[PDB]
Amino acid sequence: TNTLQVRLLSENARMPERNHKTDAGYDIFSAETVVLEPQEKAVIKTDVAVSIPEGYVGLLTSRSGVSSKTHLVIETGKIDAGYHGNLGINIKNDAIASNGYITPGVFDIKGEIDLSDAIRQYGTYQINEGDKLAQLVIVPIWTPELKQVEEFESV
Amino acid sequence: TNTLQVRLLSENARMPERNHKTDAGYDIFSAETVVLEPQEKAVIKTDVAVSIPEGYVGLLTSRSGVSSKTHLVIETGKIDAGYHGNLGINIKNDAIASNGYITPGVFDIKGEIDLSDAIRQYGTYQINEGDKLAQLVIVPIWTPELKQVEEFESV
Amino acid sequence: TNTLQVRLLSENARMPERNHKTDAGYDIFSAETVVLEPQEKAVIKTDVAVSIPEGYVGLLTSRSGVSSKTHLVIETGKIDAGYHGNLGINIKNDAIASNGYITPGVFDIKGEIDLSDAIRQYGTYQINEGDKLAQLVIVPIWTPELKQVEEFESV
Amino acid sequence: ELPTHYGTIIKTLRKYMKLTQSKLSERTGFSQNTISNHENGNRNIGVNEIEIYGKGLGIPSYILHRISDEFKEKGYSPTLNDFGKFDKMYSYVNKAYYNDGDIYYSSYDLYDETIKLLELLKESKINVNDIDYDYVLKLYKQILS
Amino acid sequence: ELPTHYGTIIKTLRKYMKLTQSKLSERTGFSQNTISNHENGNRNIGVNEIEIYGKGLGIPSYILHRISDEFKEKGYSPTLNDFGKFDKMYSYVNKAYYNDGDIYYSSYDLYDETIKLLELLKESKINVNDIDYDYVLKLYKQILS
Amino acid sequence: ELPTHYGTIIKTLRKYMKLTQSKLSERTGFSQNTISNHENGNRNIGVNEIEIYGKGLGIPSYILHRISDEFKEKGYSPTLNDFGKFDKMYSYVNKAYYNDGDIYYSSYDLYDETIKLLELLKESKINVNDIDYDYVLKLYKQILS
Ligand SMILES: [Mg+2]
Ligand code: NI
Ligand code: NI
Ligand code: NI
């Protein structure tokens, strides 16, 4: 039917966005504000849910500007058909803490630095509610029955 | 024909597992016991082989519970149609070693710590034979002939 | 029509290569020489452009020999249909710098060490023009219209 | 050839699902003679045959192998013995995994997790029949932190 | 139900694209009465309806939401006011993203980036109509380093 | 337009595969006149034409470019000269890559790896014809550690 059903789970949720009908993916937005010091990990809530149809998988994955200009690393999540809960973005700040070096500055998702409320390790990121953090790409799948064999054989 | 042929290469091999006909992937099991100190890398044997049919690629990839609650990082392997050898999981422990800190404790694939036979750097993982480490997702592919052009042109 | 259009953007560009008609991907070559000390990042130019047809996405991704025998980490780029610029490989050297340890040696893409012109941190890689760094895998995609719903409902 | 205790596993399961040897054959496509021999320990059963029994029983095949692993570690299967409780709890657990982010992204193994939830209840003399989804969900999140 | 200022956003946009209420309906499939009520502030508009207006106007839907976000931060939309300039600049910006590696791999948000380019021009009293693609491209790379 | 030494590469290869200029045309779809001019150095050959010769010769096209790269580094191609040995060895190497995990996950370039295996044999005066798959496999793993 060529439509994807979407649930907005809160007032902080943003409907996913697309530029161009031909684009591979839908940009996905953080619903919360998160501070990650170096080597810190989190799963970041979007307050969005989707219904991937049978025969597909959803790929929740990174964007070139974010991953090449920051140390934020996103591990591609595989969304099953029928997972209907809150979509989460699986993230690590893979900067390394440098000896001492402490600072009131925090980096953002564009690689820029501003001034924060506290003293932390140099290299800390702060993700904001509304940051355009990831994308969703949906691809078809093959899901066969398994057969054990002693030797492989022609189809 | 909608069946996938599988070879069990040893008595430590486990047949891949699936919950639900609609699930994207087949869970894949370690056939060996491996200790990885921080920043250590290995390709971990499964003692399983598969025959991916022509027109597809197999994706040997991570699971959300493992990658979000441990420092074990899996690099998605691309399995060609016609690769018939032992499937390997490409893994790094991306914890960083903290100064001294040494310990007899080792972390497992659930993020928990137990007591080991030796003294090692704090942050060391131990993977056990039978650990549910990765999944296999199979997707169709386009494999065209290449044409060089001076300028792009409409299809 | 089963052909992929390719533009060679310079004399350092190499036409992508494939062994076997059934192989998942096309090997992709660096067009430049780049030194990456530990934790250093770059987007490495190939001087190649492609025209991915509508309904697909191109995946610019790693090779098993490179990622399992070096610390070079490649983040899979998603190439949109209609992106016609220079293809770039998104790379980090994820070795950690060890205290002092400095050296005139640099590691290559095979994990081997040779002698360089300068003194740098132990763990530095040098990528050469013509290195077989990545592959390109092209998969079909679903690109539906979005519908907001209060509750999910059967298709 | 798989171990012979698979015969007991299939018989006891067939009985639990309220199916006759004839009705199972109707869904599996085995001969009634083959089924009886399978359960009696006559014929050894193969891995591919276990996949077919699972489909006919309406149980995920991997669960039969997990039961068998219990036979090998001890000499019997507590899970098989109290399969009714496992059924009830496994259903809550699946509903949680596919509907709650805290479970979906943290879970390691739904079967082992079902068993730890039952074992926790048993240790506090609580009956599975006298509790609901929301109680399990709160507990399940506790064991995943 | 979306805010009522969406009515103004759709009217002003409809007018900019040189379309009549009847002609928009012909492309959207709404009733002329529905469109008028939408613009007048009678009917509230839904998110799904905004997706349809976008398609009919030949404007990416997300842009309407960004304009609305300007209404909420200030009390009006500079972008909506100078939409002709935004159109011109957004087109250069898109041509750059899909044809130049330095833009494609570094860009964070094409809309915000279009606006920073306009704001830079305004601060140096330069008219968008008197410059070309190559001037914008050089500047755009500057703001992405 | 590609270098003219490609003409020699295609002639010598055509001859090695025991094919006539007429029979190659039958598989490639070039004119016999075109083929002769290609080999003689009359017509320059394009990259797209090299893809077609490869298919007709039953050789992966990239190999022709690698041979040409040998021409450019030295002034001749050792590989082309001893192409029969390269053929034999490249076949072992491919069988190893697609059937053994140690090769599949460690290999960097099958062509360069085929050549290092031949060069090692030559340095110890060993004849490629007098050894088997298992000897090569052991050696190949040695050069990948
Ligand atoms: Mg790291
Ligand atoms: Ni059940
Ligand atoms: Ni526009
Ligand atoms: Ni050959």
PDB file of N, CA, C and O in Angstrom, chain B residues 8 14-15 17-20 22-23 29 63-66 68-69 109-110 112 130-133, chain D residues 47-48 60-62 65-66 69 90 94 97-98 104-110 112 143-145:
ATOM      1  N   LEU B   8      26.943 -27.991   9.952  1.00  0.00           N
ATOM      2  CA  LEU B   8      27.508 -27.980  11.281  1.00  0.00           C
ATOM      3  C   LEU B   8      28.886 -28.611  11.217  1.00  0.00           C
ATOM      4  O   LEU B   8      29.020 -29.788  10.931  1.00  0.00           O
ATOM      5  N   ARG B  14      26.318 -24.812  17.040  1.00  0.00           N
ATOM      6  CA  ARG B  14      24.903 -24.757  17.333  1.00  0.00           C
ATOM      7  C   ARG B  14      24.108 -24.281  16.130  1.00  0.00           C
ATOM      8  O   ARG B  14      24.465 -23.300  15.492  1.00  0.00           O
ATOM      9  N   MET B  15      23.032 -24.987  15.818  1.00  0.00           N
ATOM     10  CA  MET B  15      22.139 -24.556  14.758  1.00  0.00           C
ATOM     11  C   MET B  15      21.622 -23.147  15.104  1.00  0.00           C
ATOM     12  O   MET B  15      21.256 -22.880  16.254  1.00  0.00           O
ATOM     13  N   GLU B  17      19.192 -19.866  15.452  1.00  0.00           N
ATOM     14  CA  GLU B  17      17.879 -19.858  16.103  1.00  0.00           C
ATOM     15  C   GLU B  17      17.034 -18.640  15.726  1.00  0.00           C
ATOM     16  O   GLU B  17      17.571 -17.533  15.568  1.00  0.00           O
ATOM     17  N   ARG B  18      15.715 -18.840  15.620  1.00  0.00           N
ATOM     18  CA  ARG B  18      14.776 -17.758  15.348  1.00  0.00           C
ATOM     19  C   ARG B  18      13.475 -17.916  16.172  1.00  0.00           C
ATOM     20  O   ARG B  18      12.948 -19.009  16.316  1.00  0.00           O
ATOM     21  N   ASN B  19      12.989 -16.806  16.719  1.00  0.00           N
ATOM     22  CA  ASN B  19      11.823 -16.756  17.597  1.00  0.00           C
ATOM     23  C   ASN B  19      10.517 -16.851  16.844  1.00  0.00           C
ATOM     24  O   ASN B  19       9.616 -17.593  17.171  1.00  0.00           O
ATOM     25  N   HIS B  20      10.484 -16.100  15.766  1.00  0.00           N
ATOM     26  CA  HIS B  20       9.268 -15.554  15.189  1.00  0.00           C
ATOM     27  C   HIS B  20       9.499 -15.454  13.707  1.00  0.00           C
ATOM     28  O   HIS B  20      10.544 -14.948  13.286  1.00  0.00           O
ATOM     29  N   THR B  22       8.469 -13.698  11.404  1.00  0.00           N
ATOM     30  CA  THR B  22       8.658 -12.334  10.931  1.00  0.00           C
ATOM     31  C   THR B  22       9.986 -11.634  11.344  1.00  0.00           C
ATOM     32  O   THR B  22      10.292 -10.559  10.836  1.00  0.00           O
ATOM     33  N   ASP B  23      10.759 -12.222  12.254  1.00  0.00           N
ATOM     34  CA  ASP B  23      12.004 -11.596  12.691  1.00  0.00           C
ATOM     35  C   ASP B  23      13.002 -11.461  11.545  1.00  0.00           C
ATOM     36  O   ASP B  23      13.162 -12.365  10.724  1.00  0.00           O
ATOM     37  N   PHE B  29      25.871 -18.329  17.225  1.00  0.00           N
ATOM     38  CA  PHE B  29      26.564 -18.713  18.470  1.00  0.00           C
ATOM     39  C   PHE B  29      28.069 -18.958  18.333  1.00  0.00           C
ATOM     40  O   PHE B  29      28.519 -19.602  17.382  1.00  0.00           O
ATOM     41  N   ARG B  63      23.788  -7.549  17.992  1.00  0.00           N
ATOM     42  CA  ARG B  63      22.510  -7.612  18.703  1.00  0.00           C
ATOM     43  C   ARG B  63      22.454  -6.455  19.697  1.00  0.00           C
ATOM     44  O   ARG B  63      23.468  -6.106  20.308  1.00  0.00           O
ATOM     45  N   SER B  64      21.273  -5.856  19.873  1.00  0.00           N
ATOM     46  CA  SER B  64      21.150  -4.660  20.720  1.00  0.00           C
ATOM     47  C   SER B  64      21.579  -4.823  22.184  1.00  0.00           C
ATOM     48  O   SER B  64      22.226  -3.938  22.733  1.00  0.00           O
ATOM     49  N   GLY B  65      21.194  -5.918  22.824  1.00  0.00           N
ATOM     50  CA  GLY B  65      21.576  -6.158  24.205  1.00  0.00           C
ATOM     51  C   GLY B  65      23.081  -6.249  24.398  1.00  0.00           C
ATOM     52  O   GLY B  65      23.626  -5.673  25.338  1.00  0.00           O
ATOM     53  N   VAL B  66      23.764  -6.935  23.492  1.00  0.00           N
ATOM     54  CA  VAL B  66      25.205  -7.092  23.598  1.00  0.00           C
ATOM     55  C   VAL B  66      25.941  -5.788  23.349  1.00  0.00           C
ATOM     56  O   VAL B  66      26.799  -5.394  24.151  1.00  0.00           O
ATOM     57  N   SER B  68      24.886  -2.632  23.428  1.00  0.00           N
ATOM     58  CA  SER B  68      24.584  -1.469  24.259  1.00  0.00           C
ATOM     59  C   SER B  68      24.955  -1.681  25.740  1.00  0.00           C
ATOM     60  O   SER B  68      25.080  -0.710  26.487  1.00  0.00           O
ATOM     61  N   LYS B  69      25.157  -2.925  26.169  1.00  0.00           N
ATOM     62  CA  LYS B  69      25.529  -3.138  27.569  1.00  0.00           C
ATOM     63  C   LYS B  69      26.972  -3.628  27.782  1.00  0.00           C
ATOM     64  O   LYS B  69      27.384  -3.840  28.920  1.00  0.00           O
ATOM     65  N   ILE B 109      29.187 -11.371  28.481  1.00  0.00           N
ATOM     66  CA  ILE B 109      28.467 -10.825  27.360  1.00  0.00           C
ATOM     67  C   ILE B 109      27.170 -10.150  27.815  1.00  0.00           C
ATOM     68  O   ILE B 109      26.482  -9.514  27.016  1.00  0.00           O
ATOM     69  N   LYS B 110      26.846 -10.278  29.102  1.00  0.00           N
ATOM     70  CA  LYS B 110      25.684  -9.591  29.684  1.00  0.00           C
ATOM     71  C   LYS B 110      26.055  -8.352  30.469  1.00  0.00           C
ATOM     72  O   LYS B 110      25.180  -7.731  31.083  1.00  0.00           O
ATOM     73  N   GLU B 112      28.027  -8.454  33.128  1.00  0.00           N
ATOM     74  CA  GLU B 112      28.289  -8.855  34.508  1.00  0.00           C
ATOM     75  C   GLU B 112      29.729  -9.338  34.724  1.00  0.00           C
ATOM     76  O   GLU B 112      30.416  -9.749  33.782  1.00  0.00           O
ATOM     77  N   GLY B 130      29.141 -21.083  23.213  1.00  0.00           N
ATOM     78  CA  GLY B 130      27.694 -21.044  23.387  1.00  0.00           C
ATOM     79  C   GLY B 130      27.063 -19.667  23.621  1.00  0.00           C
ATOM     80  O   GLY B 130      25.831 -19.555  23.743  1.00  0.00           O
ATOM     81  N   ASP B 131      27.894 -18.624  23.708  1.00  0.00           N
ATOM     82  CA  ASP B 131      27.385 -17.256  23.816  1.00  0.00           C
ATOM     83  C   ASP B 131      26.646 -16.842  22.553  1.00  0.00           C
ATOM     84  O   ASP B 131      27.087 -17.082  21.423  1.00  0.00           O
ATOM     85  N   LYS B 132      25.496 -16.227  22.761  1.00  0.00           N
ATOM     86  CA  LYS B 132      24.670 -15.757  21.667  1.00  0.00           C
ATOM     87  C   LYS B 132      25.127 -14.354  21.221  1.00  0.00           C
ATOM     88  O   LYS B 132      24.562 -13.344  21.617  1.00  0.00           O
ATOM     89  N   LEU B 133      26.141 -14.341  20.359  1.00  0.00           N
ATOM     90  CA  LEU B 133      26.969 -13.175  20.061  1.00  0.00           C
ATOM     91  C   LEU B 133      26.474 -12.303  18.906  1.00  0.00           C
ATOM     92  O   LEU B 133      26.548 -11.072  18.968  1.00  0.00           O
TER      93      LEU B 133
ATOM     94  N   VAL D  47      18.000 -33.274  13.277  1.00  0.00           N
ATOM     95  CA  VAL D  47      17.749 -31.835  13.508  1.00  0.00           C
ATOM     96  C   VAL D  47      16.666 -31.302  12.575  1.00  0.00           C
ATOM     97  O   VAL D  47      15.801 -30.541  12.990  1.00  0.00           O
ATOM     98  N   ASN D  48      16.697 -31.706  11.315  1.00  0.00           N
ATOM     99  CA  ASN D  48      15.666 -31.262  10.400  1.00  0.00           C
ATOM    100  C   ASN D  48      14.263 -31.737  10.783  1.00  0.00           C
ATOM    101  O   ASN D  48      13.264 -31.124  10.406  1.00  0.00           O
ATOM    102  N   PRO D  60       8.178 -22.712  18.919  1.00  0.00           N
ATOM    103  CA  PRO D  60       9.485 -22.418  18.303  1.00  0.00           C
ATOM    104  C   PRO D  60      10.487 -23.552  18.536  1.00  0.00           C
ATOM    105  O   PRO D  60      10.706 -23.906  19.699  1.00  0.00           O
ATOM    106  N   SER D  61      11.073 -24.105  17.478  1.00  0.00           N
ATOM    107  CA  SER D  61      11.931 -25.293  17.565  1.00  0.00           C
ATOM    108  C   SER D  61      13.079 -25.190  18.577  1.00  0.00           C
ATOM    109  O   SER D  61      13.435 -26.169  19.244  1.00  0.00           O
ATOM    110  N   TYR D  62      13.669 -24.008  18.674  1.00  0.00           N
ATOM    111  CA  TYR D  62      14.829 -23.803  19.529  1.00  0.00           C
ATOM    112  C   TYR D  62      14.508 -24.138  20.982  1.00  0.00           C
ATOM    113  O   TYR D  62      15.386 -24.607  21.726  1.00  0.00           O
ATOM    114  N   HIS D  65      15.316 -27.724  21.853  1.00  0.00           N
ATOM    115  CA  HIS D  65      16.741 -27.924  22.081  1.00  0.00           C
ATOM    116  C   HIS D  65      17.146 -27.422  23.469  1.00  0.00           C
ATOM    117  O   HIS D  65      18.034 -28.013  24.095  1.00  0.00           O
ATOM    118  N   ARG D  66      16.516 -26.345  23.947  1.00  0.00           N
ATOM    119  CA  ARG D  66      16.854 -25.800  25.275  1.00  0.00           C
ATOM    120  C   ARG D  66      16.429 -26.753  26.378  1.00  0.00           C
ATOM    121  O   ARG D  66      17.119 -26.878  27.395  1.00  0.00           O
ATOM    122  N   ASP D  69      18.888 -29.441  26.476  1.00  0.00           N
ATOM    123  CA  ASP D  69      20.086 -29.003  27.205  1.00  0.00           C
ATOM    124  C   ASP D  69      19.914 -29.088  28.720  1.00  0.00           C
ATOM    125  O   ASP D  69      20.887 -29.317  29.443  1.00  0.00           O
ATOM    126  N   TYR D  90       6.506 -16.916  29.325  1.00  0.00           N
ATOM    127  CA  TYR D  90       7.076 -16.651  28.000  1.00  0.00           C
ATOM    128  C   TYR D  90       6.215 -15.720  27.150  1.00  0.00           C
ATOM    129  O   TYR D  90       6.718 -15.036  26.269  1.00  0.00           O
ATOM    130  N   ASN D  94       7.391 -12.053  25.792  1.00  0.00           N
ATOM    131  CA  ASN D  94       7.397 -11.690  24.380  1.00  0.00           C
ATOM    132  C   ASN D  94       6.668 -10.402  24.110  1.00  0.00           C
ATOM    133  O   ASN D  94       7.101  -9.621  23.268  1.00  0.00           O
ATOM    134  N   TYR D  97       9.080  -7.581  25.117  1.00  0.00           N
ATOM    135  CA  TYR D  97      10.159  -7.382  24.137  1.00  0.00           C
ATOM    136  C   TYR D  97       9.715  -6.609  22.889  1.00  0.00           C
ATOM    137  O   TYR D  97      10.455  -5.748  22.387  1.00  0.00           O
ATOM    138  N   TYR D  98       8.511  -6.903  22.399  1.00  0.00           N
ATOM    139  CA  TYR D  98       8.049  -6.273  21.175  1.00  0.00           C
ATOM    140  C   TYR D  98       7.260  -4.980  21.408  1.00  0.00           C
ATOM    141  O   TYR D  98       6.825  -4.355  20.446  1.00  0.00           O
ATOM    142  N   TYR D 104      13.428  -4.249  24.744  1.00  0.00           N
ATOM    143  CA  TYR D 104      13.858  -4.555  23.377  1.00  0.00           C
ATOM    144  C   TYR D 104      15.365  -4.372  23.160  1.00  0.00           C
ATOM    145  O   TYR D 104      16.034  -5.229  22.569  1.00  0.00           O
ATOM    146  N   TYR D 105      15.891  -3.263  23.677  1.00  0.00           N
ATOM    147  CA  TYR D 105      17.294  -2.902  23.511  1.00  0.00           C
ATOM    148  C   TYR D 105      18.261  -3.461  24.560  1.00  0.00           C
ATOM    149  O   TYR D 105      19.485  -3.347  24.415  1.00  0.00           O
ATOM    150  N   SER D 106      17.732  -4.065  25.616  1.00  0.00           N
ATOM    151  CA  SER D 106      18.610  -4.597  26.656  1.00  0.00           C
ATOM    152  C   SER D 106      18.645  -6.113  26.759  1.00  0.00           C
ATOM    153  O   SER D 106      19.616  -6.686  27.280  1.00  0.00           O
ATOM    154  N   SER D 107      17.594  -6.757  26.269  1.00  0.00           N
ATOM    155  CA  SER D 107      17.441  -8.207  26.420  1.00  0.00           C
ATOM    156  C   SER D 107      18.614  -8.994  25.819  1.00  0.00           C
ATOM    157  O   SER D 107      19.182  -8.608  24.793  1.00  0.00           O
ATOM    158  N   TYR D 108      18.986 -10.089  26.478  1.00  0.00           N
ATOM    159  CA  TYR D 108      20.032 -10.960  25.951  1.00  0.00           C
ATOM    160  C   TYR D 108      19.463 -12.296  25.417  1.00  0.00           C
ATOM    161  O   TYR D 108      19.826 -12.731  24.317  1.00  0.00           O
ATOM    162  N   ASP D 109      18.577 -12.939  26.180  1.00  0.00           N
ATOM    163  CA  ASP D 109      17.981 -14.210  25.752  1.00  0.00           C
ATOM    164  C   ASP D 109      16.604 -14.390  26.383  1.00  0.00           C
ATOM    165  O   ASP D 109      16.483 -14.525  27.598  1.00  0.00           O
ATOM    166  N   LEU D 110      15.558 -14.360  25.565  1.00  0.00           N
ATOM    167  CA  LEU D 110      14.192 -14.379  26.077  1.00  0.00           C
ATOM    168  C   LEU D 110      13.882 -15.650  26.905  1.00  0.00           C
ATOM    169  O   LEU D 110      13.155 -15.582  27.899  1.00  0.00           O
ATOM    170  N   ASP D 112      16.150 -17.740  28.658  1.00  0.00           N
ATOM    171  CA  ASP D 112      16.804 -17.639  29.964  1.00  0.00           C
ATOM    172  C   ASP D 112      16.115 -16.586  30.844  1.00  0.00           C
ATOM    173  O   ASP D 112      15.975 -16.765  32.045  1.00  0.00           O
ATOM    174  N   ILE D 143      15.795  -6.982  36.390  1.00  0.00           N
ATOM    175  CA  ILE D 143      16.821  -7.990  36.152  1.00  0.00           C
ATOM    176  C   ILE D 143      17.675  -7.651  34.926  1.00  0.00           C
ATOM    177  O   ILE D 143      18.714  -8.269  34.706  1.00  0.00           O
ATOM    178  N   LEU D 144      17.251  -6.670  34.137  1.00  0.00           N
ATOM    179  CA  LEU D 144      18.064  -6.218  33.010  1.00  0.00           C
ATOM    180  C   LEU D 144      18.967  -4.994  33.278  1.00  0.00           C
ATOM    181  O   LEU D 144      19.724  -4.581  32.397  1.00  0.00           O
ATOM    182  N   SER D 145      18.913  -4.423  34.479  1.00  0.00           N
ATOM    183  CA  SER D 145      19.846  -3.353  34.836  1.00  0.00           C
ATOM    184  C   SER D 145      21.079  -3.891  35.561  1.00  0.00           C
ATOM    185  O   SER D 145      21.026  -4.926  36.222  1.00  0.00           O
TER     186      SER D 145
END
